[PDB]
Structure formats: C-alpha cells, structure tokens
Amino acid sequence: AVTGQVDVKLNISTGCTVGGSQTEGNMNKFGTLNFGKTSGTWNNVLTAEVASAATGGNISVTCDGTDPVDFTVAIDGGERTDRTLKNTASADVVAYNVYRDAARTNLYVVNQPQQFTTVSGQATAVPIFGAIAPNTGTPKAQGDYKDTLLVTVNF
Amino acid sequence: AVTGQVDVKLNIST
Amino acid sequence: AVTGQVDVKLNISTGCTVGGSQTEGNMNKFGTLNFGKTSGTWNNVLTAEVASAATGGNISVTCDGTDPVDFTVAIDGGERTDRTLKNTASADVVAYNVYRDAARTNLYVVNQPQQFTTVSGQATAVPIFGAIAPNTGTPKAQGDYKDTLLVTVNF
Amino acid sequence: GCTVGGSQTEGNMNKFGTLNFGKTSGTWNNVLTAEVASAATGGNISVTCDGTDPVDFTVAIDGGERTDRTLKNTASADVVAYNVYRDAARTNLYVVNQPQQFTTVSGQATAVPIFGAIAPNTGTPKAQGDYKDTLLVTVNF
Amino acid sequence: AVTGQVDVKLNISTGCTVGGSQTEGNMNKFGTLNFGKTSGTWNNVLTAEVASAATGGNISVTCDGTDPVDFTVAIDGGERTDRTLKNTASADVVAYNVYRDAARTNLYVVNQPQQFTTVSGQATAVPIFGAIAPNTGTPKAQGDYKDTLLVTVNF
Amino acid sequence: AVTGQVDVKLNISTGCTVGGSQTEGNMNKFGTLNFGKTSGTWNNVLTAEVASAATGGNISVTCDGTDPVDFTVAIDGGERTDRTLKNTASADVVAYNVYRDAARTNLYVVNQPQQFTTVSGQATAVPIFGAIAPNTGTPKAQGDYKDTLLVTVNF
Numbered sequence A, C, E, F: 001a002v003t004g005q006v007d008v009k010l011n012i013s014t015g016c017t018v019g020g021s022q023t024e025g026n027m028n029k030f031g032t033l034n035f036g037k038t039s040g041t042w043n044n045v046l047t048a049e050v051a052s053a054a055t056g057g058n059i060s061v062t063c064d065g066t067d068p069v070d071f072t073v074a075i076d077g078g079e080r081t082d083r084t085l086k087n088t089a090s091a092d093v094v095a096y097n098v099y100r101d102a103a104r105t106n107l108y109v110v111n112q113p114q115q116f117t118t119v120s121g122q123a124t125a126v127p128i129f130g131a132i133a134p135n136t137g138t139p140k141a142q143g144d145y146k147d148t149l150l151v152t153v154n155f
Numbered sequence B: 001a002v003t004g005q006v007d008v009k010l011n012i013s014t
Numbered sequence D: 001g002c003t004v005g006g007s008q009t010e011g012n013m014n015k016f017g018t019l020n021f022g023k024t025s026g027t028w029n030n031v032l033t034a035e036v037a038s039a040a041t042g043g044n045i046s047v048t049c050d051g052t053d054p055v056d057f058t059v060a061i062d063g064g065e066r067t068d069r070t071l072k073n074t075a076s077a078d079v080v081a082y083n084v085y086r087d088a089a090r091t092n093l094y095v096v097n098q099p100q101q102f103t104t105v106s107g108q109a110t111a112v113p114i115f116g117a118i119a120p121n122t123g124t125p126k127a128q129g130d131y132k133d134t135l136l137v138t139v140n141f
Helices: none
Strands: A002-012 A016-019 A022-024 A027-038 A050-052 A059-063 A069-075 A084-087 A093-095 A097-099 A114-118 A123-126 A129-131 A143-154 B002-012 C016-019 C022-024 C027-038 C050-052 C059-063 C069-075 C084-087 C093-095 C097-099 C114-118 C123-126 C129-131 C143-154 D002-005 D008-010 D013-024 D036-038 D045-049 D055-061 D070-073 D079-081 D083-085 D100-104 D109-112 D115-117 D129-140 E002-012 E016-019 E022-024 E027-038 E050-052 E059-063 E069-075 E084-087 E093-095 E097-099 E114-118 E123-126 E129-131 E143-154 F002-012 F016-019 F022-024 F027-029 F031-033 F050-052 F059-063 F069-075 F084-087 F093-095 F097-099 F114-118 F123-126 F129-131 F151-154
Touching: A002 C016, A002 C084, A016 B002, A050 A059, A059 A069, A059 A114, A084 B002, A114 A123, C050 C059, C059 C069, C059 C114, C114 C123, D002 E002, D036 D045, D045 D055, D045 D100, D070 E002, D100 D109, E016 F002, E050 E059, E059 E069, E059 E114, E084 F002, E114 E123, F050 F059, F059 F069, F059 F114, F114 F123
Parallel strands: A002 C027, A027 B002, D013 E002, E027 F002
Antiparallel strands: A002 C143, A016 A059, A022 A027, A027 A050, A059 A123, A069 A114, A069 A143, A084 A093, A084 A143, A097 A129, A143 B002, C016 C059, C022 C027, C027 C050, C059 C123, C069 C114, C069 C143, C084 C093, C084 C143, C097 C129, D002 D045, D008 D013, D013 D036, D045 D109, D055 D100, D055 D129, D070 D079, D070 D129, D083 D115, D129 E002, E016 E059, E022 E027, E027 E050, E059 E123, E069 E114, E069 E143, E084 E093, E084 E143, E097 E129, E143 F002, F016 F059, F022 F027, F031 F050, F059 F123, F069 F114, F069 F151, F084 F093, F097 F129
C-alpha cells in the first residue's frame, strides 16, 4: 500500500484560449490532417494542411488581454510515438511529419514548444502542415491509415 | 495548458 | 473509557515499488497536475498531465520480482471529496476529474482500483490525465486554485 | 479481392481438403460423421479477405462427380449417399449450387466448416473397398 | 471466384460402431452430463456421469470383428471451446471438465485421442465422468446452464 | 469417425450440499470405513462406522432452503462392483456390506437411492454402517485390504 499525494493547480487570472476546436466528449478535437486518397506507391510527397474541426480552416488561437502574449505550441509523436499512421485492420505503418512553415522546413519537433506570438484583438493561426515522404519501395496494403496527434498549446 | 487532438488520415487504395 | 485494539501488519516478502515520488516529510509526494494559467471564463477544456515530483515526467511504477505482477491504482476525491479545486483565499471552487487514457474516457473513479500490469526489468508509467470542463457561465474569482489528490497504489 | 487459405495447388486446380469419414463395416447403424481437413495445414479451410472493411463473401459446394452427392466404389458400381452441412449440428445444409453467405472481418481468417454426414445404412451391406467423391467447393464473391 | 476440390472418402471394409446413441436428426445424440440442481455458491465439487440417450446407462462402444481393435475417444471443448456451461438467458458461465477415470484424474484433454481397447463379442463402456470445481466466490445467476460437448469416437 | 453430442446441464437455483467431505484433488473425499486390525480368521462380525474425512464424525448433509427437502443417498459396489476389499499385494478378497441403520438390517442396496429427509437450519447425518461376515473358514493373507466405495448423494 503506497499512498501518495498529487498537487492539483490552476491559476485563474489572465489566460489564452484556442479557437477552431470542438469538444469531443472531454477532449478538445482540434482538427484533421487529411492527406486524401493515394495508391500503394506514390512518387510525389503527399502533403495536406490541418483543417480545424469547428470551422474547417486553420486553428485560430487568440489570447485574452491587452499586451502581446508569447504562447507556445507543442505536438507529440502520435499514438505510437514515432509519427506513423496505422492501417485500421493490418499492421502496416505510414511514416509522416508535421511542419510549421509552408515550405516543409521548420519541423514541429516531438514534444517541443515551437514559439508563437499573439496580439490583442486578433487571432493568430497555427499552421500544422503535414508532409509524407515519397514511398517508391513497397506498396502498403489497401485501407484507411490513421493517427491522432495530440497538439499541446501551453504557456 | 490546452491540449487537443488532430486526427491524421490517408486512404491508400487507388 | 473505551479502550480497543488495532492490529498492525506488514508482509515483508516480495513487493512492488512506486518511482517518481519524493518524500515530503512522511508523505510520498507523487506529483503535480498543473493546468496552467487561465481566464475567468474558459471555452476550451483545460487539460494537463501529472508531472512526477522526482523526475518531472510520468510516475514510473516498477515491481520487484520476475513474474509479471498485477497492481492496482486508486485515486481519491481530493480534499473536499468531490474533486474541486479551492481558491486559496475565497470559497470559489473549480470542478475537475482525472482520467487514465489520453482521450479523457477511462475515468479514475473515486476510491476505485483501476487495474495495471507490470513486467520484470521494466517500469510502467501511471498516466493521470487531468481534465476540466469548459466554464462558460460564471467567471471564478482571480487567484490560485488548489487540491491535493491522494493517489493510492495498492496491491 | 478475397483469398482462400488452407488449399494446395494440385496441378492447376486448388486442392481444398479431404472429408475423411474413416473406416466402416457393410452396415453401419450410427450416422458416419467427419469434418473437412484442409490439404495445406490439416485443420479447417481458413478464408481471409485482403481488405480493411468487412467483406461479405459466399461459399457454394456442388453435388460431387455424379451431381447427387454419392461416393462411388473405385471398382464396383455401389454408391454411398452423403451430404455436407455448415453447422456442427448437421442442420444448415450446404444446398447444391447455393451461395451459403459468410462474413470476414479486419485482420482475421474466417474458417469454412464443411461438416460431412452420412445416413445410417441398416439395409443392404455395400461392397468392400474404397468409396470416393470430389466435391468442388466454390468460394465466390 | 476461387473454385477448389474436396476429396470425400469412406473405406467400407471392417469397422467399429458406437452403441448408446440416438440419431438426433442427422447428428448422433450420445448422452447427457446432468450435474443436477445446485445453489448459487456450492462448496462441494459437483459431479455426475454421462447418461446415454438410448439406454440411460454408459455409452457402450462395440467393434465389429474378431481381433481386439484399439479405438480412440476424443472430446472437444464445448460450444465456446473452453468447457463452460452458459446460462440460457444471461451471459454467466460455469467452467467444468470431463475425466475418464472414476477419481477425476485422467482428464479427457481437449481434442485428444484418449486410447481404448475392445474385444470381440463384447461392448466396452466409455466413461465420461463430469466434474465441476467448488464455486465459493460469486453466486452465478439463477436458471439453466447448458453446453453441448461433441464426443468424437475415431479410429 | 463417429462424432456425437453430449448435452451438459446444471440447474443453478436452490440446491442441497453435503458436509463432512474434503476435496481430494477433483473428487470429494467423503470418509473412511475403518474396520481396524484383525486376524486371519475372525469369529465375530467385524463392524465399524464411516468417519468423515473433514471432521472425523458422521457425514452431515444439510440443504440450502426453508422447506424440508427429500434427498436420496446411493452407494455403489466398490472398485470391483461386488463390495470386496482387495489386498494391496496379493489377490485375496474380503466381502463386506454397508447398512444404513445401527442394527445392520437396512442395507444400502447397490446403486439404489436410499431416501432421506432434511429440514431447514439443521444438518442430517448419513450413517454408513459397515459390516463384515464372520470368516471361520480360510485365513486371508496378511497385509492391508482396501476398497473405495463411491457414495452418491443425488436429488
């Protein structure tokens, strides 16, 4: 019998809120990274942007205050922690990555706070640009591949 | 700390 | 004068130990559930994970032996027994809950042994995922809200 | 598409299995009963579908060499009437040239139970020897 | 369209027959393993013997010939393949097992040919001794529990 | 290949239980009929009562309910089916019999349900009185003679 304590805390004062999300039960549904349909072996880098579940556009984070707040954005490694989509039925995997800039250069490194700025009376967009490498080796099995990345807007 | 989910999808078929 | 007996017992043989805790005086400090800063009325579900007081990551329970032991995890209802954080100065309360899975579905029911597995030469993590409902009604007073959940790793 | 496991390619024809009733006397009072044994593994034919979503495939068995489900003696002209059922209680019969429905699910191989059954012959003793038949099982979509 | 062949065979020459069975439609009804009535929690091992459907006594297998034939007996795992009786209405299960000897020691292992001997002009009995463990934990729901073991007399 | 069915059944509702037994593996050990030591040729009828393996006294059958249930008791013919004890080493036999009443009159006939009554909140004893005829003819060989009678409490 090892009984222990867990201090719970919350500082209600002046915070920042994330728009574009829908409450899926008790977990914020931020959006979808839909690469679309594809064949077994694709030569072109498959690339799609996150579509917020609430509006359809990009996640719009706004802060509540008058001074420009600096908030951070961190995305995790997905269900299996290595950014791989898994086929619903078979065990095939599809490696992918999420970048922050339009040219697929600034990568959202696993469990890292990619910095962001936000001014009063404005909503800043969180571009989560997906990208998949060209698979010109083995044709992955037919079906639907999925993953649930947890995006962590933290301060 | 606002943690949220982003469903990733890909339909490998044709 | 009602004098009575209390039998004390301890079976020293082959037990299981919880890592990630720090001994706060004579009580094991397991960690912190830090939701962060927030405004009076938040529309997004505030959500944070427990951070072990010893390492900063998740509580890592390991057992001492060779066969996989099945240990249980039970969390209580907090200081007031209804999972509410209380403002340090005023009497305002903030209802919350702790879940076990990443999607805020498998709730750690009050005083219930949520089952867990553990194999030899490995440490299993105890995910205590916090979650707070969207308060879009009354703005709670400014200040710091706290609670001390007692996590009970028992066999 | 969907594929059938448990078969061995006999030349250019898929050998699915054997319905071995075993040895018996001229006149048997008990219903002789045996299950199909796949030629590849020895167990039941395991059909799996190459897909993610569930697929509904059908199974049809024909009437044998002579089209009336009769085993024939290799040498003489004696016949032994039989039937193949789908369920363990010999009730759901695989009707001649009929698609008995079947389901198959994500990442799994479904078994095709072909349960044989022979009526009690308590009338005339069939001649000694080996009785055979080749049922053509038709897994179609 | 995957069309395949199934070779059917039967060697009519000199075989062995099982007595004590009744033809239920096109399936041989060998008998009944009736443990009788019982309460929710029984402390004594419930134990009963198979009663042939044709005579009421034990299944009497006789062979047709002059030399002593060695025939085998195999019993399967029941409807659900784990030797559990199921309540007709609810989903409660009652684990049991069938043994070959009177002292509940020689178990009829699942899908195994327990050997047997048989001489000319004699019928050998097939003792299928049932046995149920003492349930002194949870009281199973009221009603009738059933199972249909398929006994496989093979050569 | 003669495959057949064996229907298994159990009616969990309101049953009767037998006390005084110990579970020997998966078979209920009811007791011992110890006639004691004796010489090759005894002139007096050797006579002893069953001693329950659990308590040492008589088997105490109790029923679980409020109305007086009428349960039956049946004893079989022993290992060889003719109530004979066999020497562990040699083939000598010692004929015996089990009676129900104290005067060795009401015999527990082979495979017969000798009736019995039982009321609520009470345990009824099952007197299994052994008796051996006076052997004043041939002296049986030295050693230990044994038998295992199967007592069948059925409803």
